[PDB]
Structure 1
Amino acid sequence: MSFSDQNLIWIDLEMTGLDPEMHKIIEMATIVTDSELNILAEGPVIAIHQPESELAKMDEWCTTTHTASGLVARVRQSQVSEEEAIDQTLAFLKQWVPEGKSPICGNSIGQDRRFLYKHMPRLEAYFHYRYIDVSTIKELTRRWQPEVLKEFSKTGSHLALDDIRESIAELQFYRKAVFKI
């Protein structure tokens, strides 16, 4: 409906660990905003099935985090593979943003892009090569006027959709708090 090459694709992944060569994607979510950060549509929220041997690579931090959130139980119950998750996500995105136009948007989104390169290259290809990393702005604010950061709080639940929603809210806060455009 509001299909435009100015729209922004927001994405978050949850993984069994930090190393793309070793670990696996267990959840994915996407959100599309317009260029002014108004949320236009939320994409598929997909817990991706992984066998126990892949879940068994998780360290204590990932095990407790993803178990307490209910994600591990959703992963075990899920019947959706990476390729099906890719198919679902691309069928969503093609309705809102053309291929190759939106930078990848999120918090420390470079780490997610590594997992996309390795495990979902067809989806990585959908993004423009640039990055919109909200944590870049967080870091500069911490150094230039850290007191600003006390006016914003994150829950940080590691549920992919809630975490992207918090990323958009964080950038919305910065536009009023540290930007003048």
Structure 2
Amino acid sequence: GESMAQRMVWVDLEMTGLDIEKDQIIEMACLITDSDLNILAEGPNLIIKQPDELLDSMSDWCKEHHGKSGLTKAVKESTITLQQAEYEFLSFVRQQTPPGLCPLAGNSVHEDKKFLDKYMPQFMKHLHYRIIDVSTVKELCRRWYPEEYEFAPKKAASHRALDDISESIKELQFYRNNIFKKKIDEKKRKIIENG
């Protein structure tokens, strides 16, 4: 019960840009962690077909970044429609999380949520409305723990979906281990008794 409801649905998307009125999802990856950030299951990792005209009119930033990562070429070759991709993700979360109870998780994952609410609404219906925004914790770390903030892991920032999920989890793990308060565990309790 509670353990299942405390899972997290980590997602990262690539889009043709930041304009919700025109831009589209071109890559999406998803995995599930338990409440303690251990990966329980790897979900689909999909490159979604979108029209040539849209890719050709992307911002210079997106042309450069999705170009050099290979993503633009892979979008043009993709046979995966948005609808089929959404189904794969929805089927996956239906196997992994109780309906309505688990949040999206990632860095500034509200941006992903904005695109998913519009373009994958049935996927989003399986999830809670709250999010685990790693960048909220980042912004609190920078303010409240400036010394510790300097030791956060460096990110490769490849703008590819699955690799970026792993970096997001690693960042949150860093904050848990370095700016949240310490707690008892099985090993410390056995030592306390032994002393």
Amino acid of the structure 2 residue aligned with 1:23: D
Residue 33 of structure 1, CA deviation: 0.3
Q: 1:8 and 1:68 mapped to 2: Cα distance?
A: 31
Residue 18 (structure 1) aligns with: 18
Q: 1:149 and 1:155 mapped to 2: Cα distance?
A: 17
Residue 175 of structure 1, CA deviation: 0.3
Residue 57 (structure 2) aligns with: 57
Residue 124 of structure 1, CA deviation: 1.6
Equivalences for residues 76-155 of structure 1 within 5 A: 76-151=76-151, 152-155=153-156
Could you list the per-position Cα deviations for residues 51-78 of structure 1 after superposition, in whole angstroms to 9, with x for gaps in the alignment?
1111123111111111111111111111
Secondary structure of the 1:49 match is coil
Native 8 Å contact 1:16 1:57 kept in 2: no
Q: 2:44 and 2:180 mapped to 1: Cα distance?
A: 31
Radius of gyration: which is bigger? 2
Could you list the per-position Cα deviations for residues 126-163 of structure 1 after superposition, in whole angstroms to 9, with x for gaps in the alignment?
21011110000100111122222222211111110000
Residue 165 (structure 2) aligns with: 164
Q: 2:58 and 2:126 mapped to 1: Cα distance?
A: 29
Native 8 Å contact 2:48 2:81 kept in 1: yes
Secondary structure of the 2:175 match is helix
Amino acid of the structure 2 residue aligned with 1:107: N
Could you list the per-position Cα deviations for residues 67-114 of structure 1 after superposition, in whole angstroms to 9, with x for gaps in the alignment?
111111111111001110011111111111112111111110111111
Residue 179 (structure 1) aligns with: 180
Residue 20 of structure 1, CA deviation: 1.2
Provide the aligned length of Structure 1 versus Structure 2: 179
Native 8 Å contact 1:49 1:78 kept in 2: yes
Native 8 Å contact 2:94 2:126 kept in 1: no
Native 8 Å contact 1:23 1:57 kept in 2: no
Residue 43 (structure 2) aligns with: 43
Q: 2:42 and 2:15 mapped to 1: Cα distance?
A: 20
Secondary structure of the 1:80 match is coil
Amino acid of the structure 1 residue aligned with 2:33: T
**Could you state the TM-score of these two structures normalised by the residue count of structure 1?**
0.95
Secondary structure of the 1:44 match is strand
Secondary structure of the 1:166 match is helix
Instruction: Structure 2: state its 5+ residue gaps.
Output: 183-195
Native 8 Å contact 1:66 1:72 kept in 2: yes
Amino acid of the structure 1 residue aligned with 2:102: S
Could you say what the CA RMSD is over the residues aligned between the two structures, in angstroms?
A: 1.2
